[PDB]
Amino acid sequence: MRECISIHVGQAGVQIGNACWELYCLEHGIQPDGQMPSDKTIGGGDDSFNTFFSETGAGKHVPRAVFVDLEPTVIDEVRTGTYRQLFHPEQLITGKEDAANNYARGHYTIGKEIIDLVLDRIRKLADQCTGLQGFLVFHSFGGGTGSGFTSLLMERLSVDYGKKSKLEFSIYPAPQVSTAVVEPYNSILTTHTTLEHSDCAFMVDNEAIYDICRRNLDIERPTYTNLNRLISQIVSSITASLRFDGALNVDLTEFQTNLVPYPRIHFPLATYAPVISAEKAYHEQLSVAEITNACFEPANQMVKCDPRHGKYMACCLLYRGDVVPKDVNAAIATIKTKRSIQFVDWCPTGFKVGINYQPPTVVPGGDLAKVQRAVCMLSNTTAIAEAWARLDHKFDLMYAKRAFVHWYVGEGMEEGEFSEAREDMAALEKDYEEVGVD
Amino acid sequence: REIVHIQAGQCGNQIGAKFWEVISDEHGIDPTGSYHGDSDLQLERINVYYNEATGNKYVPRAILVDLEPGTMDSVRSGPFGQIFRPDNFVFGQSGAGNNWAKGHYTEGAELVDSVLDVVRKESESCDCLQGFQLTHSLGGGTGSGMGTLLISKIREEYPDRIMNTFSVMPSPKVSDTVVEPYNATLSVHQLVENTDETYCIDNEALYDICFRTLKLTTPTYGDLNHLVSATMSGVTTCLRFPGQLNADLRKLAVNMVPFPRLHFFMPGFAPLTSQYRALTVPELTQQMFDSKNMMAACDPRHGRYLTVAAIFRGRMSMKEVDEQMLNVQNKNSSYFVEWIPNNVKTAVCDIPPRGLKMSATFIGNSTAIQELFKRISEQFTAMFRRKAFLHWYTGEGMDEMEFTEAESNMNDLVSEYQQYQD
Amino acid sequence: MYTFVVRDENSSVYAEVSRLLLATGQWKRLRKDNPRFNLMLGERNRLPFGRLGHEPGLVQLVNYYRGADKLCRKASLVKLIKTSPELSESCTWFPESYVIYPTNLTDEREVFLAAYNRRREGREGNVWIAKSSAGILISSEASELLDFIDEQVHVIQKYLEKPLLLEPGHRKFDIRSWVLVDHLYNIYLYREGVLRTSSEPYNSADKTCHLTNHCIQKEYSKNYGRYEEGNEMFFEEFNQYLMDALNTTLENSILLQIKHIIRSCLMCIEPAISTKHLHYQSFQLFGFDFMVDEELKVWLIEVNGAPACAQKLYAELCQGIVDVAISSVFPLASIFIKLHHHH
Amino acid sequence: MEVIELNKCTSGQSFEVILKPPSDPSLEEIQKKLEAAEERRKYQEAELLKHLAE
Numbered sequence A: 001m002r003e004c005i006s007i008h009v010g011q012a013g014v015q016i017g018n019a020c021w022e023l024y025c026l027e028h029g030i031q032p033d034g035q036m037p038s039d040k041t042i043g044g045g046d047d048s049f050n051t052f053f054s055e056t057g058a059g060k061h062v063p064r065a066v067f068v069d070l071e072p073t074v075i076d077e078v079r080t081g082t083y084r085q086l087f088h089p090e091q092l093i094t095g096k097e098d099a100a101n102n103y104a105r106g107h108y109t110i111g112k113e114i115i116d117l118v119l120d121r122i123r124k125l126a127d128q129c130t131g132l133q134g135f136l137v138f139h140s141f142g143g144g145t146g147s148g149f150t151s152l153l154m155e156r157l158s159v160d161y162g163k164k165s166k167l168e169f170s171i172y173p174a175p176q177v178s179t180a181v182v183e184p185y186n187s188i189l190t191t192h193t194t195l196e197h198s199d200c201a202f203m204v205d206n207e208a209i210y211d212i213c214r215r216n217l218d219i220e221r222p223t224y225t226n227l228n229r230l231i232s233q234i235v236s237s238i239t240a241s242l243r244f245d246g247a248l249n250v251d252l253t254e255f256q257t258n259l260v261p262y263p264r265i266h267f268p269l270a271t272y273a274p275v276i277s278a279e280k281a282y283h284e285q286l287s288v289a290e291i292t293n294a295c296f297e298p299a300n301q302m303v304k305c306d307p308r309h310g311k312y313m314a315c316c317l318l319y320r321g322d323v324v325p326k327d328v329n330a331a332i333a334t335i336k337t338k339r340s341i342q343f344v345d346w347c348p349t350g351f352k353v354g355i356n357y358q359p360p361t362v363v364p365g366g367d368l369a370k371v372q373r374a375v376c377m378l379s380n381t382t383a384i385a386e387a388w389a390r391l392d393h394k395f396d397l398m399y400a401k402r403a404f405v406h407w408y409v410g411e412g413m414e415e416g417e418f419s420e421a422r423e424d425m426a427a428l429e430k431d432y433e434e435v436g437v438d
Numbered sequence B: 001r002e003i004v005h006i007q008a009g010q011c012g013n014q015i016g017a018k019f020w021e022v023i024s025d026e027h028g029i030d031p032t033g034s035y036h037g038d039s040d041l042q043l044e045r046i047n048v049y050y051n052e053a054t055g056n057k058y059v060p061r062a063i064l065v066d067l068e069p070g071t072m073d074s075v076r077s078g079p080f081g082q083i084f085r086p087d088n089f090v091f092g093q094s095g096a097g098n099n100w101a102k103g104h105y106t107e108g109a110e111l112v113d114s115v116l117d118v119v120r121k122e123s124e125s126c127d128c129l130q131g132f133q134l135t136h137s138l139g140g141g142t143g144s145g146m147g148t149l150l151i152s153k154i155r156e157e158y159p160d161r162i163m164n165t166f167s168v169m170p171s172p173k174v175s176d177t178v179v180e181p182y183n184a185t186l187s188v189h190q191l192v193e194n195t196d197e198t199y200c201i202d203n204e205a206l207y208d209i210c211f212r213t214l215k216l217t218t219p220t221y222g223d224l225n226h227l228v229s230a231t232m233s234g235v236t237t238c239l240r241f242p243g244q245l246n247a248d249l250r251k252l253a254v255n256m257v258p259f260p261r262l263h264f265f266m267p268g269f270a271p272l273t274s275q276y277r278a279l280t281v282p283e284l285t286q287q288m289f290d291s292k293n294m295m296a297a298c299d300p301r302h303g304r305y306l307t308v309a310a311i312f313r314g315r316m317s318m319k320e321v322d323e324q325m326l327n328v329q330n331k332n333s334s335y336f337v338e339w340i341p342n343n344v345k346t347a348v349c350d351i352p353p354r355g356l357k358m359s360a361t362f363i364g365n366s367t368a369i370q371e372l373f374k375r376i377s378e379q380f381t382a383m384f385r386r387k388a389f390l391h392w393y394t395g396e397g398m399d400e401m402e403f404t405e406a407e408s409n410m411n412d413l414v415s416e417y418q419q420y421q422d
Numbered sequence C: 001m002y003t004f005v006v007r008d009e010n011s012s013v014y015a016e017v018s019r020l021l022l023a024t025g026q027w028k029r030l031r032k033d034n035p036r037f038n039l040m041l042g043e044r045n046r047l048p049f050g051r052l053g054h055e056p057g058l059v060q061l062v063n064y065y066r067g068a069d070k071l072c073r074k075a076s077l078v079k080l081i082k083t084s085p086e087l088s089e090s091c092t093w094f095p096e097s098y099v100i101y102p103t104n105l106t107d108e109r110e111v112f113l114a115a116y117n118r119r120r121e122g123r124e125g126n127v128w129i130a131k132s133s134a135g136i137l138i139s140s141e142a143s144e145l146l147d148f149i150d151e152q153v154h155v156i157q158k159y160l161e162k163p164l165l166l167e168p169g170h171r172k173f174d175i176r177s178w179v180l181v182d183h184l185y186n187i188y189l190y191r192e193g194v195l196r197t198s199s200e201p202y203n204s205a206d207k208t209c210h211l212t213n214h215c216i217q218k219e220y221s222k223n224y225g226r227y228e229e230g231n232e233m234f235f236e237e238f239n240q241y242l243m244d245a246l247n248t249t250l251e252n253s254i255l256l257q258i259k260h261i262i263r264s265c266l267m268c269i270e271p272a273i274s275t276k277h278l279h280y281q282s283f284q285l286f287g288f289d290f291m292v293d294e295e296l297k298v299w300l301i302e303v304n305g306a307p308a309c310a311q312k313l314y315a316e317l318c319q320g321i322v323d324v325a326i327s328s329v330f331p332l333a334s335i336f337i338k339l340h341h342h343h
Numbered sequence D: 001m002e003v004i005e006l007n008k009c010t011s012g013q014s015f016e017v018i019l020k021p022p023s024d025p026s027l028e029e030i031q032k033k034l035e036a037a038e039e040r041r042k043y044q045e046a047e048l049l050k051h052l053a054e
């Protein structure tokens, strides 16, 4: 058994971690007061769920998580929420003045005053680990804290834990729910300084989650609560192999091996299905072939892009529910003859399948309906580079006029770091085109 | 996160008094300071403008400044006069005589340190001070001359706090003295340097709205102050109620100010009725962007919006709000600069203002605001080319060079707005 | 009131479409770099498809199909026909082609010589043609063709040595059909085609009578404009010639094979370019080019992704584009033949 | 169509199906950049206080 520490930075990171750990407890049967009746080993153990939970003498199962926000309004909801008894106050770090949607303010100005406090609280959780795998970092691209402080944390984590892996869960900025105009700046500033420090990053475009909630859940104006419950399902599918018995993606190193052959191209595309509204009284249960075919529909992806015009480097199928290997191969054979699936010539055309018999858990009273089987596909396609092109274009538009740049220079940041970051993204876009286009 | 409010001069105090009268009703605060509301949203962000005292009393975090005792004695005797902290009344006796030099260099310099002691006392007890907001007119002496003096000294003591102002622009249509363009030009240069956000409230627009739209044939200052009251309440809604967009002063400045000197906003309000008819969301948005419903007396079709901040208040379809906002941008995309993607941001509040089922407040950073500065500059040069009325200012120690520089500082500001309009 | 942008000034087709949209009073043109558009008349090279379909409250439409270059490139068309099972290695309506890379650069040099030696071993017509997307040589010797390509990717296919020759004149020609595919992947064939004819008599033994390009017939040919105006014969006159000379019609003898080729090519790439469930929609006008032999058999020469219409047919075709491809998505306030198929 | 490396257990099973074979900065450097930005803030603030002193 090897432990994993989750880190939640900024409002988006905290509220998404708040929804994931809620879903984690419902899956592992953990109650809000940390008690787990099915855990017969009191006060310790090396089970597969102990990779995400520590155990106390009283029998409480404490999440191996750290919450960091530069202003205390969001984590105060976790301090007084339903699961206030899971965490101890050492895991919840709050400041008093946020980064104000300014990357430089969260990285240089305010991040410096609190970086040594966060690492000390992370070291307290690492000292309870007999064999630390690494870290799972939850943050947003557009926020000043989610972008500014995360990149500073990812730099120090490589210094203090060089042999450990680090995975990201990133929220790509979408204007339908965005709160700042300079989010294209923050997203590219934080991707530049974190690219060499992240081994595998799962991007989640809020634009896709928003429309999935509008289209498949009949939600008129989706809120953050709607978006975060759907995101936690995707995150739960990705981390299910670390929390349950199995043989696929059993540790963090296996994520980089099975999904990242090229280090810089470490942004797998996540597609999830089925998303059924709990308001529908009776829905026809989708089969294995129907939910695997939905993994190749762009309307179900976390980022809207076209994998038909882009080559694959890896592909994982994570099934949860009534799924057997025979039905999987029958679906893959049918899909291969009716879809445009192109792999790079230096990679095998194949799929790594993972089946967990426990069907997906739904939050009671939530928006997602209970299904008998579901699948999350992790595909490293060069088509996700469209998200960088959209982001890099909005960057070039504003930076040509040096708009809002004075806010970043006023926090001690140099103007040259802007072009230095954009030149790195220009190289990232070029690396995708060499792999995906002929 | 607290905000320290300051009101200076006759116009600053009469407008600020009505502002505290309007928002105290929205938060359920009576003229004595006791809370008598029915919703928890009224108190959730009450600390932004109110200090909690003994007996659960809410005292406004306001400082009342003037060089004459006249206007402040009317505020203390007004409806909500007994709610202001008595020590926060700082006033002289000589007056400013509509002279910027008297407020900024002589009479106001004798009183500015007294004011800064109350400013300091209010900031010392703040857990997290966002900054300051100042209400004043630019055409007078105290609010213009001493107001900009306070802004300059507050920035020296609080350099990392946001400076917000509600500045009333003088107009020949609503004019007290002829030296008003002199005071405005001198104060505009101070605002270009030492403020982060300035709401340009043109008395010409306030007059035209009261006359053409509200059908008031003889508008008074009280009628004009009613529009400022409803506008100041709307522009501060995101600060006084729980929300995601533009929650504090700094985040508002980051979304609205792309260049540090172009921070002068055109405020707009909707509806403006002379009254029981319900207003649909499409109607709120069309009137909100209409030139007739804005307080700057500028034509947006003569410029381009750099950034826009919209606020809808009331129980309405947030889905329909998004559709109408996207419809104004997609059907008039020639008036929003294309080199700032998604420059329009919309927030929704559930609590409407008094007397309206639903309303909408417009905050625009448009390059058409140069029309306001061009107008003031034209009225300034008309007198300055003959050195007319300068003896009122040179008699207080000023030199003609300081006027020439202030003239050049505003012509540069006008040129900078024209740079980004093309 | 709809909006649209223009990112290709050299487009003679969509310049008229942009003129017709403004004439309706319900379309407003924006700057070429404005993102708040309903329609994009994009450029040929490096069209930013990744930035389409990401504007809330805006149904976006583009006049090009992403991935359609697989059909509109010389090397891509040959690779698509051989590898696609729907078209198969044995294709009756496509001339035997081969992809040949220059020696200074997969390649099919050894495979092209295998079929060439079979045509040398058995006494058959062994005249081929070399061409590319960027200069054409027609030689019966394979050594002259391979030495010429070495002097970018090229393709060598069998040259039709027995083409259908119009009389009087005894001359070569080709047929251009304009095909429009809307967002629903309906295939519309314009009822009006053009016969780009040569004015010189075909000499099976100088590449003027062998090449029917418009620019070559206007510069190198001597009898340009003698038989028909601008070396362009429309379908009404050509139908009359087939009835008078060959006792057949254009619909039966030629148009059935043409409509069959258009369906097969577009249905093949449909799963790869279809914007049925995509966040943006695509339509595209195509220009199919055909060669007819003396046996009245139709062969596919190439497909054009940015075709130019005939002068007489600009008004009618561009109006049909607005009706079925633009106003079908953005309604306001038939000249095509629909080629039905199983989606 | 080959299925390899099948691992079964109580909670599920995993395998792999193949369709076709193929064809850091130190803490010293970070503190320097963090203190260089704080120095540019102190310089810009000192120049502001000097401008206000005039």
Ligand SMILES: Nc1nc2c(ncn2[C@@H]2O[C@H](COP(=O)(O)OP(=O)(O)OP(=O)(O)O)[C@@H](O)[C@H]2O)c(=O)[nH]1
Pocket (backbone or CB within 6 Å): A009, A010, A011, A012, A013, A015, A016, A070, A098, A099, A100, A101, A102, A106, A140, A141, A142, A143, A144, A145, A146, A147, A171, A173, A174, A177, A178, A179, A180, A183, A206, A224, A227, A228, A231
């Ligand atoms: N999916 C999701 N996205 C969020 C959530 N909260 C904020 N975002 C997105 O994150 C971006 C802003 O990042 P924030 O997390 O709010 O900012 P921050 O990390 O707190 O940093 P500060 O600027 O200091 O407040 C916006 O584009 C939002 O769309 C959330 O709860 N769920």
Ligand SMILES: Nc1ncnc2c1ncn2[C@@H]1O[C@H](COP(=O)(O)OP(=O)(O)CP(=O)(O)O)[C@@H](O)[C@H]1O
Pocket (backbone or CB within 6 Å): C095, C129, C131, C157, C158, C159, C160, C161, C173, C174, C210, C211, C212, C213, C289, C291, C301, C302, C304
């Ligand atoms: N295999 C073949 N057999 C007989 N004739 C052929 C041939 N390939 C080409 N030709 C003739 O040569 C001409 C050139 O064809 P091609 O389509 O390659 O040129 P092009 O693409 O530059 C003009 P366009 O853009 O109008 O199609 C054709 O008009 C055709 O008449």
Ligand SMILES: Nc1nc2c(ncn2[C@@H]2O[C@H](COP(=O)(O)OP(=O)(O)O)[C@@H](O)[C@H]2O)c(=O)[nH]1
Pocket (backbone or CB within 6 Å): B008, B009, B010, B011, B012, B014, B015, B096, B097, B098, B137, B138, B139, B140, B141, B142, B143, B144, B168, B169, B170, B171, B174, B175, B176, B180, B203, B206, B221, B222, B224, B225, B228
């Ligand atoms: N809207 C409004 N404008 C005012 C009011 N009082 C004065 N003004 C304007 O402000 C200018 C006079 O400034 P004044 O308040 O006398 O300056 P003071 O000496 O600092 O008090 C004139 O141009 C007036 O138009 C008021 O109550 N409401």
Ligand SMILES: [Ca+2]
Pocket (backbone or CB within 6 Å): A039, A040, A041, A042, A043, A044, A045, A046, A055
């Ligand atoms: Ca245990």
Ligand SMILES: [Ca+2]
Pocket (backbone or CB within 6 Å): B094, B107, B110
């Ligand atoms: Ca005195």
Ligand SMILES: [Mg+2]
Pocket (backbone or CB within 6 Å): A010, A011, A071, A098, A143, A145
């Ligand atoms: Mg925050």
Ligand SMILES: [Mg+2]
Pocket (backbone or CB within 6 Å): B010, B140, B176
């Ligand atoms: Mg007065």
Ligand SMILES: [Mg+2]
Pocket (backbone or CB within 6 Å): C302, C304
């Ligand atoms: Mg061509």
